[PDB]
Symmetry: none
Subunit: 132 residues, 8 copies
């Protein structure tokens, strides 16, 4: 269910909330049979909520992915999507991810993000999953 959430009061007195549900980063033995290589499958669900003046008429983007820490830090957006209304969620099952040159372990920071067409944004973070 609910893994983590965070709310923020935007610069128009709306209470923006974003949520990270049912996160599962499933590691697998690499298709390339290389010890340096990490492969896994991202599953999970982002939801958002908005309370306050003009909630029912909302215009933002909703995101879900993670950061990879190995040969640096890069961010993967598994999906990134235009939403409207004061509520909603989007779910993913078996997104494919991989990275190589992985010298001694690979950590994965899962996030959920809400971005308003008004520029505002809030993002919630769960605890990293260790890919080794």
């Amino acid at each position: 269910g609910l893994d983590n959430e965070l709310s923020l009061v935007d610069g128009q007195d709306r209470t923006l909330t974003v949520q990270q549900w049912d996160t599962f980063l499933n590691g697998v033995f690499p298709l390339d049979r290389n010890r340096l290589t990490r492969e896994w499958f991202h599953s999970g669900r982002a939801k958002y909520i908005v309370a306050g003046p003009g909630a029912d008429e909302f215009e933002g983007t909703l995101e879900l992915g993670y950061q990879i820490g190995g040969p640096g830090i890069q961010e993967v957006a598994t999906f990134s999507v235009d939403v409207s209304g004061a509520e909603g969620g989007v779910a993913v099952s078996n997104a494919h991810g991989t990275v190589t040159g992985a010298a001694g372990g690979v950590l994965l920071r899962p996030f959920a993000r809400l971005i308003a067409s008004t520029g505002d944004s809030v993002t919630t973070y769960g605890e990293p999953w260790n890919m080794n």
Copy 2:
């Protein structure tokens, strides 16, 4: 026939399914006569289904391909295509595939995919074939 399938209850309470059907990964002698080269052709069929609120008005995309595990991990989309309606599925005969630098064998993971215009996606993966 039915090789594999998977379901996701999506973010609007639509039960999304995707099926992988009649897959053949045909390994043949390479046209370039190099021992380092694999050549297959891809055959098979993806099917999707969606029950729930608004099933006969679903918009998304249907894909089918495989991952190449050898010189590294790369995903190949044999086809990728905008669908509509509660059901349907597109089938492929004799895609061409090939790869070189194939230092000892080459593995292949075939996947079928349902992604919706609402951001949600599900992918069904089958068991790898070993070109070698």
Copy 3:
């Protein structure tokens, strides 16, 4: 005449055919006078046939070409063209080809492909020609 053909029943219950006619791959003495160069001319004809529910309302694409095997494996589409209606076909006399770096031997794999705008496709292959 008819060199080869294949048939695929597509995901909307149409019996899709593809034929490959009159093929010639005229190999010739290289204009660069290089022993490592191969120079050739494609001639041939693609045609196709759709039957079953909704045939006179078909949108897809037809192709004719070859893979080149030797320096690597590379696909050349001598022609690639939009098509509509239940039958069609197109022809080529003296298309031009040349490759170099050729470590002795160039094999040639001639094909005809009908692709469907509904994402489906079928492709007929003939027996490789030897350019040396």
Copy 4:
């Protein structure tokens, strides 16, 4: 609360203000476990005010971000957005930053900026945060 602010009387006798609120530069352990990487999270509120003739008909861009100082000087705009009217503001929570090759210590100079469609720009700055 309010961290810093600055006001410019621009080229058409509007007194343009810009403000920087609630600033957290949250330093954390680098996901890549690398001693030469720095990783943080930016959180902040940006506002502007315009007084004077035609204030209610002001067009411009509002921005929040920082400068990174270590491997050189770079500017990062956490956000940058169009604005209309004489008041406005936008807030960001948990934006992710990172930089590497960080040869002893990293400093972060945070700003809020207001640029007018008439070419005028005022930018306010805080005291640098130290990422080590």
Copy 5:
């Protein structure tokens, strides 16, 4: 007069003919005074004729030039133009050609080509001239 010509029975039973008249490849001492350079001037005539159903309303392209062979095999198109009608033809006087690195001779292969808006194509070549 007529050097050569070829006919093709295209995908719609139009008899496509293409012609090449009055060819001259005028080789001359290179403006750079270099042993390794070949310079010349290209003269010739391209003609076509279409026979059968839908002829007098024909859509295609007409081309004239040659292949160069020395440091590789490269096609030059002295002209390429759209045409309509069952008949037509365009001529060229003193086109300019050069190539360098001409490590011992350069051969030139002249062609007239006709291509149809229907995908079908026919091309007639003459025997190579020897710029040396």
Copy 6:
């Protein structure tokens, strides 16, 4: 106040004036702590005036900035904007500027520039600021 100005009688008998006001080049110890780096903040006002026939219908561009002198000479326009009519001007406070490989010293030459839609232009220069 006014730092400097210059005027031109342009090719259509209008007297173009440009002016540079309240220039400040705020040199500060650099954020990268690097002895070859220079960092500063630019603040300033540009104004123009057009006299003569058709003055209330003048169209041009107004620019303000500086040349950087050390690693070479490079021009930076802090801003560049389309203006209309006989009068106007724009202002900038705390714009950010930096440059590295400053092998001993950097000199900064400040300017304001008036460019007319008719191609004409006048540019006034201040005395160089020594960023060391």
Copy 7:
């Protein structure tokens, strides 16, 4: 006066002439004052005439320039312009040319070209000027 000319019976029985009048290639002592450099000023006129069917409705393009023979053979088009009517001409005075790396001397072959919108072209050539 007239330096050179050439006519061609084009592909629609029109009689197309192109002419070259008053050529001058004035060699100067080069501005860089490097003796590998050649520098010059080009002057000339190009005229055309089109007799026969539909002459007064002729649509073409008119070019004039020279080839450079030294580091290789480059084409320079001093001008290239849409002409129309059975008659026309355009003149150039004092165009700049330069080439460097020129290993003892440079030769220049001046040309006048007439290309027609129907794809036909003719081009006349004068005897080369030696630029040393």
Copy 8:
């Protein structure tokens, strides 16, 4: 005042005149403080006049600038602008020019240019200014 002019009787019996007025090329102490470096300011006026049939009907380009002679020959167009009418002219005060690798002296050849939409051009030249 007038530095130089040239006239040309053009392809349509228009006498085209270009003139160069008030030219100043002002060398200064390089801002980069490098004795390999030249830096200057360009000031000047270009004017044109046309007489003959259709003079009020004239469209062209008017340009002013100079060639640089030093690390090579390069032409700088200080302004280049579309004109209409039998008379016109545009002026520039203080344009900035700089060049480096000035391996001893730098000559600047200033020019003014009249280019007709009909293809024709005339360009008047001054005596070079020596940049050291």
